[PDB]
Design a binder for this molecule. Structure first.
Ligand SMILES: *NC[C@@H](*)CC(=O)OC
Lengths: 172, 75
């Protein structure tokens, strides 16, 4: 169905869920067949961009991540699979950004994705946009550690079923 | 004639088409330019999903009309 398959957000569904949460029309990115498509203008306006990666003519199912604009020239990459996984696409995406800018991988831990990358991108993704852009920003270590904590607090006490319940609901 | 195809990633791309071209032809034209198999493409004009067998003229797609492309992809 257009928006969610099993528990995986589609390209259509990521648009939908952002619109429902009140973010207007959000533009996403992709890396399809090793080739990125990043609309730098929209990343600027919005402050962030969910990007679907590792798809192509033979792969319908890849990984969602989040590009985040910080203040000044600085940008961030949030991969729900963790820091190491996020390093994989760091160079290719940094080469897509405006001249003179930087890209840093938010250092959250691995083993917490649990098949739910798209959901994480749409919640924790945004809370990290906020944190790195606020009045007294915490450090980039603090940000990563904080996110790791949020992911595991949210899975606690049957968190997995609750999140998947919500992805199911959103499909209707 | 020239039409536009816009994606949810903000790429707009131009195509050269006949009004008698089927929607499936258009997808083949997208496969050639973008490397995306027709398999992966849902196409939409004026909130209508377009059927593979019908032509562009079946939907009144003029010169300079903008179609929307959504890909059947997930993560
Ligand atoms: N598309 C689901 C995202 C999670 C993931 O990337 O599994 C490895």
């Amino acid at each position: 169905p257009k928006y969610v398959e099993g528990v995986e957000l589609t390209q259509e569904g990521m648009h939908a869920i952002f619109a429902r949460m009140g973010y207007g029309d959000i533009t996403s990115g992709s890396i399809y067949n090793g080739v990125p498509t990043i609309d730098t203008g929209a990343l600027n306006r919005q402050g962030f961009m969910p990007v679907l990666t590792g798809v192509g003519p033979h792969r319908d199912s890849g990984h969602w991540i989040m590009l985040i604009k910080g203040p000044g020239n600085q940008y961030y990459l949030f991969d729900p699979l963790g820091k190491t996984s996020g390093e994989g696409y760091q160079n290719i995406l940094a080469a897509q950004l405006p001249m003179g800018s930087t890209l840093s991988v938010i250092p959250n831990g691995s083993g917490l994705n649990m098949g739910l990358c798209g959901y994480w991108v749409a919640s924790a993704g945004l809370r990290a946009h906020q944190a790195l852009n606020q009045h007294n920003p915490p450090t980039l270590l603090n940000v990563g550690q904080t996110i790791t904590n949020e992911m595991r607090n949210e899975l606690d006490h049957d968190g997995y079923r609750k999140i998947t319940g919500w992805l199911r609901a959103v499909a209707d | 004639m020239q039409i536009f195809v816009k994606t949810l990633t903000g790429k707009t791309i131009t195509l050269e088409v006949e009004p008698s071209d089927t929607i499936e032809n258009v997808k083949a034209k997208i496969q050639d330019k973008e490397g995306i198999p027709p398999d992966q493409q849902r196409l939409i004009f004026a909130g209508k999903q377009l059927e593979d067998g019908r032509t562009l003229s079946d939907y009144n797609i003029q010169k300079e009309s903008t179609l929307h492309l959504v890909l059947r992809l997930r993560g």
